Design an enzyme around this catalytic site. Structure first.
Site, mmCIF file in Angstrom:
data_model
loop_
_atom_site.group_PDB
_atom_site.id
_atom_site.type_symbol
_atom_site.label_atom_id
_atom_site.label_comp_id
_atom_site.label_asym_id
_atom_site.label_seq_id
_atom_site.Cartn_x
_atom_site.Cartn_y
_atom_site.Cartn_z
ATOM 1 N N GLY A 15 5.004 -2.911 5.751
ATOM 2 C CA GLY A 15 4.409 -4.349 6.206
ATOM 3 C C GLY A 15 4.364 -4.205 7.609
ATOM 4 N N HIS A 48 -6.770 1.709 9.523
ATOM 5 C CA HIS A 48 -6.173 2.009 8.013
ATOM 6 C C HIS A 48 -6.045 0.759 7.146
ATOM 7 C CE1 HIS A 48 -1.670 1.125 7.810
ATOM 8 N NE2 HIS A 48 -1.445 2.011 8.941
ATOM 9 N N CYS A 75 3.252 -2.131 10.080
ATOM 10 C CA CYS A 75 2.051 -1.745 10.682
ATOM 11 C C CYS A 75 1.247 -2.498 11.320
ATOM 12 C CB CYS A 75 1.046 -0.813 9.636
ATOM 13 S SG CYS A 75 1.941 0.427 8.751
HETATM 14 C C1 LIG Z 1 7.816 3.664 0.265
HETATM 15 N N1 LIG Z 1 7.746 3.527 1.653
HETATM 16 C C2 LIG Z 1 6.946 2.963 2.201
HETATM 17 O O1 LIG Z 1 5.975 2.329 1.650
HETATM 18 C C3 LIG Z 1 7.002 2.578 3.783
HETATM 19 C C4 LIG Z 1 8.316 2.502 4.280
HETATM 20 C C5 LIG Z 1 8.425 2.552 5.639
HETATM 21 C C6 LIG Z 1 7.219 2.506 6.568
HETATM 22 C C7 LIG Z 1 7.257 2.238 7.908
HETATM 23 N N2 LIG Z 1 6.135 2.159 8.552
HETATM 24 C C8 LIG Z 1 5.133 2.532 8.003
HETATM 25 C C9 LIG Z 1 4.532 2.545 6.879
HETATM 26 N N3 LIG Z 1 3.689 2.820 6.280
HETATM 27 C C10 LIG Z 1 2.789 4.022 6.325
HETATM 28 O O2 LIG Z 1 3.201 4.949 6.708
HETATM 29 C C11 LIG Z 1 1.583 3.831 5.535
HETATM 30 C C12 LIG Z 1 0.588 4.915 5.725
HETATM 31 C C13 LIG Z 1 0.335 6.007 5.216
HETATM 32 C C14 LIG Z 1 -0.607 6.969 5.236
HETATM 33 C C15 LIG Z 1 -1.390 7.048 6.432
HETATM 34 C C16 LIG Z 1 -0.983 5.880 7.264
HETATM 35 CL CL1 LIG Z 1 -1.830 5.915 8.894
HETATM 36 C C17 LIG Z 1 -0.140 4.821 7.118
HETATM 37 C C18 LIG Z 1 6.043 2.703 6.138
HETATM 38 C C19 LIG Z 1 5.865 2.747 4.466
#
Ligand SMILES: CNC(=O)c1ccc2cncc(NC(=O)Cc3cccc(Cl)c3)c2c1
Ligand SMILES: CNC(=O)c1ccc2cncc(NC(=O)Cc3cccc(Cl)c3)c2c1
Ligand SMILES: [Cl-]
EC number: 3.4.19.12
Lengths: 305, 299
Positions: free
Chosen positions: B137, B41, B139
């Site tokens: 961040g 991604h 990921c």
């Molecule tokens: C507003 N909170 C965040 O931006 C956040 C907080 C916490 C997060 C913790 N881990 C990962 C994040 N990242 C994702 O889940 C981005 C994503 C979205 C759709 C599909 C996929 Cl495969 C990956 C987080 C993201």
């Protein structure tokens, strides 16, 4: 999102762990530059432990009596000195893996990571706090003496603890890296007991702010309290007094969530009175006191859910 | 004495963490030999082959410490992107890619901008999620175990679900659980308690001197599973009973005798008491974790 008991990455400390042998005793040492730091009780026998005269025992030792092993390599000891309860063994090779470091003495309530070691080999890392009674609730077996506690703020390792002994209740006692014990303990086999322990109030409040930041507000109430009334209630539950310094330190978390410190103090009072009623806060059924206000800001998001 | 949630020493993994940038997205990568592994991604209905064909090697910026690595190739394997680099990581440890089962535990080295910030221990839940601690961040952060001097990489972080729990893949890019790497309505299924792990933790409590919950009783495996199913506990198999054999022999408490203790704990609660400083039954220590922490195995 999420809230875990998190330790610092241990790599910078793993590269400093060595094994120190003197006679039949083997324990861990910390190799920084050309010096290996370890508990001075490495020169003792189990008999010597009742009333050891460390100065008398050390004067009888020569450099070649101390065997220092770094990985599969034998280091050569070229000098030795005692500083309080720590032995400093001068070696003829500087550790090429020496990180940027400082020796810091911490106060009760402060947290740190422990790299538990046996025979100079790291086995595990965990997070813990210096209790108000100056002990740590660690996980240590025989051979763990010399294992260290640390924090890594940016790229600098701040060494704050070296393990020396286990008290009869299963709790642990040790020194800073200058050999000064935390608490009224001595490196002697004598009747020593940890004093009555209390809950770290400022840390429980920080953890309640972490729960609010992560979206949980069930425990909040419409009340506030004076600092004095909070302390009168807190001490009945064996909670440490909350000082004006603690209130000031909680200022940033109060500003971020919109909940005044004395308003959060009123929720804590109510929690102590009612219990949790089958509920949890951040996956715990008890009030957690091993996260400082600094740990909560470091781990949690800057935006309240 | 003492019992803590303990992670493996993270040093062998810290030396593999790099930062991967593609366009406006920055995340973490795992640099092993001459390959950097990261969530696909990073190139983001995402048709990943269509998005990848449009990228060239120089679009991927890889930073290892203060050094910029040169990407000389790229390929996709399931949900992981593999970026071929010119330089082999001199800090590459002895390693394997392993896929774990629900109930197994592992250490997580949480990273941001290719820089490790923390290490924690966790378990793959029966619903295939992990209850981690991750911010934006994170990921590309990895989960691992250490066997002697070999690092077994078992998890790479990809996303956070709406309940605050986390989802990811093994290092071959296969997701744990019925998740997909896209922004769509996805939810973690109903979770259950890891029964064999709670029993191992009860044995750790006995080894550390906590015996208040022991009783004179025993149960059949069938009767225990009928009760366990009522409290959203995973079924206990004969394999789990066999795996608990060493702890049963050390403490003198038969596995089905410890089950009768657990049945009484589920029906009547802790009654104001704690076990190893906890008011809840802990399920994130395997039988192997308990033996390792109560023996002092080093790495
Ligand atoms: C507003 N909170 C965040 O931006 C956040 C907080 C916490 C997060 C913790 N881990 C990962 C994040 N990242 C994702 O889940 C981005 C994503 C979205 C759709 C599909 C996929 Cl495969 C990956 C987080 C993201
Ligand atoms: C077989 N288990 C143990 O003997 C044991 C278990 C667990 C232990 C945990 N930490 C340290 C140990 N070591 C000591 O406390 C040795 C000592 C004794 C009297 C004074 C001083 Cl300064 C040091 C442990 C020792
Ligand atoms: Cl401090």
């Amino acid at each position: 999102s999420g809230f875990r008991k998190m330790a610092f990455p241990s790599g910078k400390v793993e590269g400093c762990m060595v094994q120190v042998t003197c006679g039949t005793t083997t324990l861990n040492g910390l190799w920084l530059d050309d010096v290996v730091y370890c508990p001075r009780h490495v020169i003792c026998t189990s008999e010597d432990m009742l009333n050891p005269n460390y100065e008398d025992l050390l004067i009888r030792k020569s450099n070649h009596n101390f065997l220092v092993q770094a990985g599969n390599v034998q280091l050569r000891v070229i000098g030795h000195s005692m500083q309080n309860c720590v032995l400093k063994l001068k070696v003829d090779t500087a550790n090429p893996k020496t990180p940027k470091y400082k020796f810091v003495r911490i106060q009760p309530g402060q947290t740190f990571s422990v790299l538990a070691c046996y025979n100079g080999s790291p086995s595990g890392v965990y997070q813990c706090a210096m209790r108000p009674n100056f002990t740590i609730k660690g996980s240590f077996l025989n051979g763990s003496c010399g294992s260290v506690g640390f924090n890594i703020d940016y790229d600098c390792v701040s060494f704050c603890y070296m393990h020396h002994m286990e008290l009869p209740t299963g709790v642990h006692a040790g020194t800073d890296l200058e050999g000064n014990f935390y608490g009224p303990f001595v490196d002697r086999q004598t009747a020593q007991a940890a004093g009555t322990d209390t809950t770290i109030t400022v840390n429980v409040l920080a953890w309640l702010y972490a729960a609010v930041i992560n979206g949980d507000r069930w425990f909040l109430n419409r009340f506030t309290t004076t600092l004095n009334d909070f302390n009168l209630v807190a001490m009945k539950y064996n909670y440490e007094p909350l000082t004006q310094d603690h209130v000031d330190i909680l200022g940033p978390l109060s500003a971020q969530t919109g909940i005044a410190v004395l308003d959060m103090c009123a929720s804590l009072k109510e929690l102590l009175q009612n219990g949790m009623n089958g509920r949890t806060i951040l996956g715990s059924a008890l009030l957690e006191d091993e996260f400082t206000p600094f740990d909560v800001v470091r781990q949690c998001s800057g935006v309240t859910f």
